[PDB]
Amino acid sequence: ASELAARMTAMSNATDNANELKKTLSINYNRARQAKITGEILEIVAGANAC
Amino acid sequence: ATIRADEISKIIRERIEGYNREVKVVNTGTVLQVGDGIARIHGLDEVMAGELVEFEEGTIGIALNLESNNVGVVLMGDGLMIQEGSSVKATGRIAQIPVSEAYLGRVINALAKPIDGRGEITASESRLIESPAPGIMSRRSVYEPLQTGLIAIDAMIPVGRGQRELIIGDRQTGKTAVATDTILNQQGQNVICVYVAIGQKASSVAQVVTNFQERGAMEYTIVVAETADSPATLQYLAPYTGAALAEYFMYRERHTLIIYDDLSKQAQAYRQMSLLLRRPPGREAYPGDVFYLHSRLLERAAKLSSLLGEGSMTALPIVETQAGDVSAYIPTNVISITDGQIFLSADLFNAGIRPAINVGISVSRVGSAAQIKAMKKVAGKLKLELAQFAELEAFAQFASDLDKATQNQLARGQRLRELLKQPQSAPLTVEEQVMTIYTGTNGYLDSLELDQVRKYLVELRTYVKTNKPEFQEIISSTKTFTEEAEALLKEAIQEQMERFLL
Amino acid sequence: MEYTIVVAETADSPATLQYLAPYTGAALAEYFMYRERHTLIIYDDLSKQAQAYRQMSLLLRRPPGREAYPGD
Amino acid sequence: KKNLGRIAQIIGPVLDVAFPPGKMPNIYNALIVKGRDTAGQPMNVTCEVQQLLGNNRVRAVAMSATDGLTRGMEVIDTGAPLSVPVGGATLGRIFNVLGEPVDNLGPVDTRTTSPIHRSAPAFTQLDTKLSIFETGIKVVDLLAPYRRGGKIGLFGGAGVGKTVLIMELINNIAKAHGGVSVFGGVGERTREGNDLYMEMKESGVINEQNIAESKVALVYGQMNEPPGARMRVGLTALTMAEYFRDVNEQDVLLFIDNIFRFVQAGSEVSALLGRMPSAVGYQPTLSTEMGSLQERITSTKEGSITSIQAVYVPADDLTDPAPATTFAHLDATTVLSRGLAAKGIYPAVDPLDSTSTMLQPRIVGEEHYEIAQRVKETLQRYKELQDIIAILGLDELSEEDRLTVARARKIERFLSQPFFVAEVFTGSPGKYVGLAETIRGFQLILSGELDSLPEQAFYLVGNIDEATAKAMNLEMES
Amino acid sequence: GLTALTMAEYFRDVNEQDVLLFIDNIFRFVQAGSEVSALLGRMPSAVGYQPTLSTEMGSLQERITSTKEGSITSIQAVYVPADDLTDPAPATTFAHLDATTVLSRGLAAKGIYPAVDPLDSTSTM
Ligand SMILES: Nc1ncnc2c1ncn2[C@@H]1O[C@H](COP(=O)(O)OP(=O)(O)OP(=O)(O)O)[C@@H](O)[C@H]1O
Ligand SMILES: Nc1ncnc2c1ncn2[C@@H]1O[C@H](COP(=O)(O)OP(=O)(O)OP(=O)(O)O)[C@@H](O)[C@H]1O
Ligand SMILES: CC(C)C[C@@H]1NC(=O)[C@H](C)N(C)C(=O)CNC(=O)/C(=C/c2ccccc2)N(C)C1=O
Structure with missing residues (x-):
């Protein structure tokens, strides 16, 4: 019972840590997506204006 | 590069009308090409960069782009009724x-x-x-x-x-x-x-x-x-x-x-x-x-x-x-x-x-x-205790060294948190701030009720601002936390605690 | 050093010369190569040549491609 | 004999001027616009030619403001690039981008004026000797030995400790040199320049009685001062340092804060100069613009210039073109981490990304080299298993991996250090640590001797005997 | 590519024999067009290809065909730039091929040569 209780508390901690990690990852990914869209459109419009 | 803004026909007609003459359009500019927050004004030959220009509608502008034959200005409003071909006046300022x-x-x-x-x-x-x-x-x-x-x-x-x-x-x-x-x-x-x-x-x-x-x-x-x-x-x-x-x-x-x-x-x-x-x-x-x-x-x-x-x-x-x-x-x-x-x-x-x-x-x-000196003296221990709470709250669920850490985080961090929170549009004077920090970070508010910290603090504040005006005088006089103000605030908080308990 | 040539083009050189330095080294090596000798060439920081070329192309108002780098 | 031109166009700081059909000014020639701004006549609007646009018209960039300028003003060309005062007349004074003293101490003796645009020293006139110098900073002296006579860069985001590091280096090494040490603000807080100047006066370095012997020279183009000034303040500072290196044959120091703002003002200018930008909106002449500035900062047989530069990374992007191009000219970088700064580890020097070309067993010796290698190896193992120990935790690692984690934590605590210039933030006044003490302390940590004492005993101390004193104090205090 | 394709068209149509047409990187056939397209005045498309990527691919691909009187089996190598399988050039090729065969750098990194991605390589047979 004590081993299973230690496992329960360890997996609770790991779930919480993976939760905050998933949050940080989603933030960084949204930033990367906006930066990718911005750079792509800026490059396209730069080429078009250069023509 | 092949087109320009004063390329419009009436300006060239005027130029062909007389080639060599004496006076140009000095303060008088005729607007053309009212665009998107910009207006390329032909004229204003003597205009300066940064010049305020006044439109016929009433809109103010700033001469930003002083090109060769047109000056381009920036509209300081919704320049909707700026009719094309209308006059613009420089202000010299x-x-x-x-x-x-x-x-x-x-x-x-x-x-x-x-x-x-x-x-x-x-x-x-x-x-x-x-x-x-x-x-x-x-x-x-x-x-x-x-x-x-x-x-x-x-x-x-x-x-x-x-x-x-x-x-x-x-x-x-x-x-x-x-x-x-x-x-x-x-x-x-x-x-x-x-x-x-x-x-x-x-x-x-x-x-x-x-x-x-x-x-x-x-x-x-x-x-x-x-x-x-x-x-x-x-x-x-x-x-x-x-x-x-x-x-x-x-x-x-x-x-x-x-x-x-x-x-x-x-x-x-x-x-x-x-x-x-x-x-x-x-x-x-x-x-x-x-x-x-x-x-x-x-x-x-x-x-x-x-x-x-x-x-x-x-x-x-x-x-x-x-x-x-x-x-x-x-x-x-x-x-x-x-x-x-x-x-x-x-x-x-x-x-x-x-x-x-x-x-x-x-x-x-x-x-x-x-x-000021009083705030340094009283805030040193405060930033120390909140520094301790900073690692304690993130790191320990119950505690490490469960006896003093429950004497550390409970007595200091979770009560200083209620000490720091402050209502909307209610500032505190520096005497009340010094007194409030001193009441908490020395270890005087270690045993109150967590929901009664706010009430105790505000009532003690009114008490000291009623009974001990010499504390406020010795603080607003020398701006330091002397042992006199310290001791009299100590007996004041003891009085206020024994009053508030009943 | 008795068997190697050094083709230096520092950073304060014009972008034309930094763009041309690998070709200078390559012609130098090609001489010995077609004289029946074995040669070995090392273009240190070839991306710097690409950057010098991109600068030269943007200054010539050549339309840019990916990351302002020319298509070629 | 001097050309007189008319202003044809004004677009912010970039204006082009029409000259007589015969005589047009060369590139980088200074142009004086007469000017009239609610006063009698200040000629303060100096420009410099950038490109000859054709049809008797050249395009310049103003080193001052262009508000109040009219089309058709008279533009006298000076027939030569911007020359600034050099020599002992600059010692103890504060200067502009134009060599005009802003200290209100009087005018400078302008006998010797050398132009801000020159070519770099020849290849044959270059030092090849490799010397390092200790700084008193544990992580710098251990993992990134700064070369004597070489360019040294500090990379960080906003608010990670670039200026505290520059000022700590100035506190440690600048008062030891025999040569002068010039400082150039290339776009930074004017509050910081004023603070540094007042510190110089109170220290005695800038003696108000006899300015003529100060061994410092301060050039400042700050975060105001339109991009014509922020782009050439670095050049006038470099010219003043080159005079002491070349002529007097002294060993100069060249502390520069944010050479990034030189690049930034260059891109700001080049936008209105009518050029197609690069990928990140920078100027197409970015790499050669950095090269023309950094290739003059060298060590010839005459003298040496040890330059210590701060390099801003915008939005904490080390891949950004401006730091990405600074990296090539540097030879000892030191990268600061926002994560390390937020974890209280000051200085926030990222140990693994901060390298040096002098960490070699032939230059720093084999003992220093091996200790640095072992430190970087344990730090790399820690950085590897970081994400696993972030999700799961330390309980799942092996015994050797747990020992490596504990040793890496002790190392990253022993990397922090109190600074003399940061006594207000940390308290517990700064410590200077020699190189031998750092080497012995890290031998002691990695050797397993100091393996049974708290991690906090190493945090913000110098000279690991102080770590042991702090551990004893903590255990006796409980 | 059109030169070699014409040589195969003759062997399929006039000689009426099964041709076996192997092509090296057809990515190069598209990037050469993208190289010249800026100088031809054309405005840049998505990330930098010519606006006519799909039609330029389609002309040459639809010319490759078993025409019921002879057959052309065409095996084409398609360079995927930066392992971006959703790059426009390979993206517009996928629709033209019958049996695609994706190669994984993750299998090459361990030696499963031929490093053919088993779950990505589909086929219509
Ligand atoms: N110290 C406080 N005590 C009680 N309520 C507060 C306090 N500070 C803010 N609030 C409430 O929180 C709400 C948001 O606060 P505030 O107006 O300061 O943010 P804000 O600057 O408007 O944010 P944004 O401008 O981005 O909407 C307000 O309606 C205010 O009533
Ligand atoms: N060694 C240090 N010890 C304690 N605190 C530090 C240290 N270095 C930096 N800090 C903190 O970081 C903050 C920002 O530091 P600083 O302004 O010197 O660097 P920066 O902002 O990266 O450089 P710059 O001022 O050129 O933008 C300071 O307010 C200081 O409190
Ligand atoms: C904000 C206004 C009141 C001051 C301007 N001056 C500047 O921005 C910079 C700082 N300076 C000093 C210049 O000399 C160049 N002028 C402009 O850039 C400008 C720029 C500008 C941008 C957008 C709208 C109007 C003008 N001026 C003409 C200025 O007058």
């Missing part, structure tokens, strides 16, 4: 505003024109809008506190007169409650306050101005307001007009405070202006000149030397961040321009800890230079 003492108590629309509805403002005209910032010899190190009333700010992020302290956080995490607290706290001090609302909704400005008027902070405040529906040029200009209006007083030996609500909105208006002028933008479509936009504005907040009257301008810019993006573009630019920041966190703000200062990531580069 580089961009400036009327400045006076008759502005204290009014609301202004980034053009020094009252949106107040209380009539006009007399003036002795001065103050070019883009004034130069003071040099190295002109200014001086900061040495006197600018009290905000908030215990956490005045204890751990102390701000002095002449420091640019950034208020950075998410949306609806504070920063305007904080700005208004600092402005309402200037009632006794001899400090002019300027508040620039750059992109706020009109109802937010209404609430702020009515709170100012009701609480009496309008006798020493000016308000420059550009709502969300204002032209991007007006939102771009409004903090510069605020800075000129405050520099008027600052260069006359008087201390000023200025608050730029949403300086990031000025950056977004400038990005709109640049993209409509087709300038090649940098990261996230920002002009690349946006650092200069913010830095030439923030360098005007200074602490002048004794030769210049010792006047000061304190700047409290405000930057909203997207999902707490400290490392974004405009946040990092303003951080690299200012002298410390105050991080408001949406997590602590929504968790109830309402002045949501993220003290572990917020600095002030003045510190003890700004703080």
Whole structure:
């Protein structure tokens, strides 16, 4: 019972840590997506204006 | 390159009418190509860069692009009724505003024109809008506190007169409650306050101005307001007009405070202006000149030397961040321009800890230079105990060394948290701040009820401000925490505790 | 050093010369190569040549491609 | 004999001027616009030619403001690039981008004026000797030995400790040299320049009685000052340092804060100069613009210039073109981490990304080299298993991996250090640590001797005997 | 590519024999067009290809065909730039091929040569 209780508390901690990690990852990914869209459109419009 | 704006046929007809003559269109320019916040005016041969030009509709403009045959100007409003082919008149005056003492108590629309509805403002005209910032010899190190009333700010992020302290956080995490607290706290001090609302909704400005008027902070405040529906040029200009209006007083030996609500909105208006002028933008479509936009504005907040009257301008810019993006573009630019920041966190703000200062990531580069002696003496132990709580709360669920850590985190951290939280639009005097920090961080409030900390603190505050006026006298006299005030505050808190228990 | 040539082009050189230096080294090596001798050439920081070429192309108002780098 | 031109166009700081059909000014020639701004006549608007646009018209960039300028003003060309005062007349003075003293101490003796645009020293006139110098900073002296006579860069985001590091280096090494040490503000807080100047006066370095012997020279183009000034303040500072290196044959120091703002003002200018930008909106002449500035900062047989430069990384982007190009000219970098700064580890020097070309067993010796290698190896193992120990935790690692974690934590605590210039922030006044003490302390940590004492005993101390004193104090205090 | 394709068209149509047409990187056939397209005045498309990527691919691909009187089995190598399988050039090729065969750098990194991605390589047979 004590081993299973230690496992329960360890997996609770790991779930919480993976939760905050998933949050940080989603933030960084949204930033990367906006930066990718911005750079792509800026490059396209730069080429078009250069023509 | 093959086409031009004055390529229109009537100008060439006029030129073919007479080739060599004497006089050109000197102050008289005929508008053409009214575009998107710009108007390419043919004429104005003797015009200067930065010149105010006046249109037939009534709109003001600034001569920005002085090309070879046309001058291109920027419209200072919704220049809708600017009829093409109409006259434009130069004023000879580089961009400036009327400045006076008759502005204290009014609301202004980034053009020094009252949106107040209380009539006009007399003036002795001065103050070019883009004034130069003071040099190295002109200014001086900061040495006197600018009290905000908030215990956490005045204890751990102390701000002095002449420091640019950034208020950075998410949306609806504070920063305007904080700005208004600092402005309402200037009632006794001899400090002019300027508040620039750059992109706020009109109802937010209404609430702020009515709170100012009701609480009496309008006798020493000016308000420059550009709502969300204002032209991007007006939102771009409004903090510069605020800075000129405050520099008027600052260069006359008087201390000023200025608050730029949403300086990031000025950056977004400038990005709109640049993209409509087709300038090649940098990261996230920002002009690349946006650092200069913010830095030439923030360098005007200074602490002048004794030769210049010792006047000061304190700047409290405000930057909203997207999902707490400290490392974004405009946040990092303003951080690299200012002298410390105050991080408001949406997590602590929504968790109830309402002045949501993220003290572990917020600095002030003045510190003890700004703080008074009493606040240093009482705040040392306070920042120490909150430092301890910082690692304790994140690290230990129950505790390590469960006996003293439950004597550490409970007695210090979770009660000092209730000590630091402060209601909306209720600043504290420095005596109450010193007393409140001393009551907590020495270890006197270790056994109260966690829901009774607030009540005990406010009632003890009224008690000491009723029974012990000599404490307030010895604090407002020498500004130090003597053993006399210490001991009498000790017996005062013992009396107040034995009174409050029953 | 008795068997090697050094073709230096520092950073304060014009972008034309930094763009041309690998070709100068390659012609130098090609001489010995077609004289029945074995040669070995090392273009240190070839991406710097690409950057010098991109600068030269943008200054010539040649339309840019990915990351302002020319198509070629 | 001097050309007189008319202003044809004004677009912010970039204006082009029409000259007589015969005589047009060369590139980089200074142009004086007469000017009239609510006064009598200040000629303060100096420009410099950038490109000859054709049809008797050249395009310049103003080193001052252009508000109030009219089309058709008279533009006298100076017939030579911007020359600034050099020599002992610059010692103890503060200067502009134009060599005009802003200290209100009087005018400078302008006998010797050398132009800000020159070519770099020849290849044959270059030092090849490799010397390091200790700084008193544990992480710098251990993992990134700064070369004597070489360019040294500090990379960080906004608010990570670039200026505290520069000022700590100035506190440690600048008062030891025999040569002068010039400082150039290339766009930074004017508050900081004023603070540094007042510190110089109170220290005695800038003696108000006899300015003529100060061994410092301060050039400042700050965050105001339109991009014509922020782009050439670095050049005038470099010219003043080159005079002491070349002529007097002294060993100069060249502390520069934010050479990034030189690049930034160059891109700001080039936008209105009518050029197609690069990928991140920078100027197409970015790499050669950095090269023309950094290739003059060298060590010839005459003298040496040890340059210590701060390099801003915008939005904490080390891949950004401006730091990405600075990296090539540097030879000892030191990268600061926002994560390390937020974890209280000051200085926030990222140990693994901060390298040096002098960490070689032939230059720093084999003992120093092996200790640095072992430190970087344990730090790399820690950085590897960081994400696993972030999700799961330390309880799942092996015994050797747990020992490596504990040793890496002790190392990253012993990397922090109190600074003399940061006594207001940390308290517990600064410590200077020699190189031998750092080497012995890290031998002691990695050797397993100091394996049974708290991690906090190493945090913000110098000279690991102080770590042992702090551990004893903590255990006796409980 | 059109030269070699014409040589195969003759062997399919006039000689009426089964041709076996192997092509090296057809990515190069598209990037050469993208190289010249800026100089031809054409405005840049998505990330930098010519606006006529799909039609330029389609002309040459639809010319490759078993025409009921002879058959052309065509095996084409398609360079995927930066392992971006959703890059426009390979994206517009996928729709033209019958049996695609994706190669994984993750299998090459351990030696499962031929490093053919088993779950990505589909086929219509
Ligand atoms: N110290 C406080 N105590 C109680 N309520 C507060 C406090 N600070 C803020 N609030 C409440 O939180 C709400 C948001 O605060 P505030 O107006 O300061 O943020 P804001 O600057 O308007 O954010 P944004 O401008 O991005 O919407 C307000 O309605 C205010 O009533
Ligand atoms: N060694 C240190 N010890 C304690 N605190 C530090 C240290 N270095 C930096 N800090 C904190 O970091 C903040 C920012 O430091 P600083 O302004 O010197 O660097 P920076 O902003 O990266 O450089 P710059 O001033 O050129 O933008 C300071 O307010 C200081 O409180
Ligand atoms: C904001 C106004 C009142 C001051 C301007 N001056 C500057 O921005 C910079 C700082 N300076 C000093 C210049 O000399 C060049 N002028 C401009 O860039 C400008 C730029 C400008 C941009 C957008 C709208 C109008 C003008 N001016 C002509 C200025 O007058």
